[PDB]
Amino acid sequence: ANLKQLKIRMKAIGSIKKITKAMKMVAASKMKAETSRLSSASEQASRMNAMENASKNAGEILSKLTLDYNKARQAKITMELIEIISGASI
């Protein structure tokens, strides 16, 4: 399915997953500080949990898209090879 587009979409999700993972790290640090200081901490806790869930969901989608990219890659090799063989037969 136009492996070029799939790879672009795969690259985007990886950046999203990476940025979301980093924010979870930052949220843990900031949540620690507030609990030490102790609603603000609640905001940070929800953010940390939400980023974990988002990075998890992004990872699942990235794995699923990787399967499709490998599937598309095999088909492309097969299709090009068939063209070459059909031309060589005659």
């Binding site: 979870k24 843990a28 940390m48 399967l67 490998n70 095999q74 097969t78």
Partner: protein
């Protein structure tokens, strides 16, 4: 010499014969070559012509050159004379140690064992490694897939298997290098004769070596695997003992078959492989099994191209694998140097029916305990230790002890590490892990369950530690 070379196309060679023609798969020998050049018959084109694949470089051939029909497929010398000797695909010695002493010469191609002589009720092959015999048992006479990077634990693990199978069992081993880097071959051959796995003195060297170098043309890298397989079949049938067949990554065997098919002009399959992928692979994998006389257990390396498990080659291969042994780099960093991962490694023979209920329960419990610890590690990296309950801390301690326990010293590496190896047996292994899950060792220190053979050894060390203070 009633044959002639009609045409030459790279490695492929067509031979014009007179009178009777060589049966397919027979081995033909060219005359007048500087080195022995063998041709494997592939098909009968008609008009008294055959098309064959050369085992060596066809450079310097001439049309009309005489060819001799050996009358049978490639026959390799089998027996204890091959032990400690490097053999070629056509059975020639490449170790410069003189001619091989052979009891008989067996054909590379033969039909797999019948349905009657097949062995039922598959049983474990006790290798001696705690983790393998516990979590990923090796089915006797079954294909095993080894996923391991360059130099993680591979070579030392292979040598340990050979030595342990030689001591506990009466069997030999066979290492077939399918398209291996020649440099690595010298390192392996020299790595042996240093660990004493093979020696020049007769009566020793319980391991044969078949090598098909990358610089060899297709047809050699494709049939070299069958050559090693044949060497092992002799020991199985005649000697009646258990054999261990190591195969350099089977992907290269599959790749070489694909190349000969293309050369022969066969239309390629889905992703460029030959149409006979399943059959070409199934032939070798089926001649490897357990019989009434003995068994051939194969440990073969798996290379996944592009990290695509759904690729035809690894997929058709996994169809045969009974167990998988995954070597992990992280385990090496931690200081544990059996690299095998407990969770990633799997065995199809692991079920409460083939093995006892207690063994299955212990393995599942160990896997669950290790898996829970993995989840908690991701947690503590963010939160910390105090955040954990007391049960979680107990689980961490228990899991670290088990993980450290999974390691054990090997005889082959004792000179290097200075600690002698341990051939842990199956029964004591299961008993030790069951007791550990009960908590018999929670009081002792973690550093005690490291490179220890059996639980008793670790317990004795722990009591000694208590005495020190």
């Amino acid at each position: 010499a009633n044959g002639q070379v009609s045409q030459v196309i790279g490695a492929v060679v067509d031979v014009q014969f007179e009178g009777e023609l060589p049966q397919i798969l027979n081995a033909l020998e060219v005359q007048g070559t500087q080195h022995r050049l063998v041709l494997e018959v592939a098909q009968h084109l008609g008009d008294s012509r055959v098309r064959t694949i050369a085992m060596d470089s066809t450079e310097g051939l001439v049309r009309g050159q005489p060819v001799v029909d050996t009358g049978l497929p490639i026959s390799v010398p089998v027996g204890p004379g091959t032990l400690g000797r490097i053999m070629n695909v056509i059975g020639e010695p490449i170790d410069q140690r003189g001619p091989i002493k052979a009891a008989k010469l067996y054909p590379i191609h033969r039909d797999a064992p019948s349905f009657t002589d097949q062995a039922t009720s598959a049983e474990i092959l006790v290798t001696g490694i705690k983790v393998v015999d516990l979590l990923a048992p090796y089915a006797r006479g079954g294909k095993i897939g080894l996923f391991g990077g360059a130099g993680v634990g591979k070579t030392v693990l292979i040598q340990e298997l050979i030595n342990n199978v030689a001591k506990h069992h009466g069997g030999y081993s066979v290492f077939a290098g399918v398209g291996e880097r020649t440099r690595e071959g010298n390192d392996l051959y020299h790595e042996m004769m240093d660990s004493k796995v093979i020696s020049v003195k007769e009566g020793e060297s319980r391991c044969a070596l078949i090598f098909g170098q990358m610089n060899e043309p297709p047809g050699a890298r494709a049939r070299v695997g069958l050559t090693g397989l044949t060497v092992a079949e002799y020991f199985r049938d005649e000697e009646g003992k258990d054999v261990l067949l190591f195969v350099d990554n089977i992907f290269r065997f599959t790749q070489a078959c694909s190349e000969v098919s293309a050369l022969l002009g066969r239309i390629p399959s889905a992703v460029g492989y030959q149409p006979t992928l399943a059959t070409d692979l199934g032939a070798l994998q089926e001649r490897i099994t357990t019989t009434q006389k003995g068994s051939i257990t194969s440990v073969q390396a798996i290379y996944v191209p592009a990290d695509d498990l759904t690729d035809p080659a690894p997929a058709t291969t996994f169809a045969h694998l009974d167990a998988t042994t995954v070597l992990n780099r992280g385990l090496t960093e931690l200081g544990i140097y059996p690299a095998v991962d407990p969770l990633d490694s799997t065995s199809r023979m692991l079920d409460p029916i083939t093995i006892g209920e207690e063994h299955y329960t212990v393995a599942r419990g160990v896997q669950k305990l290790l898996q829970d610890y993995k989840s908690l590690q991701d947690i503590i990296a963010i939160l910390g230790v105090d955040d954990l309950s007391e049960e979680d801390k107990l689980v961490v301690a228990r899991a670290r002890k088990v993980q450290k326990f999974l390691s054990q010293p090997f005889f082959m590496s004792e000179v290097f590490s200075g600690i002698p190896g341990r051939f842990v047996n199956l029964k004591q292994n299961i008993a030790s892990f069951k007791a550990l899950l009960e908590g018999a060792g929670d009081e002792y220190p973690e550093s005690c369950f490291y490179m220890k053979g059996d639980l008793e050894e670790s317990l004795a060390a722990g009591r000694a530690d208590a005495l020190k203070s």
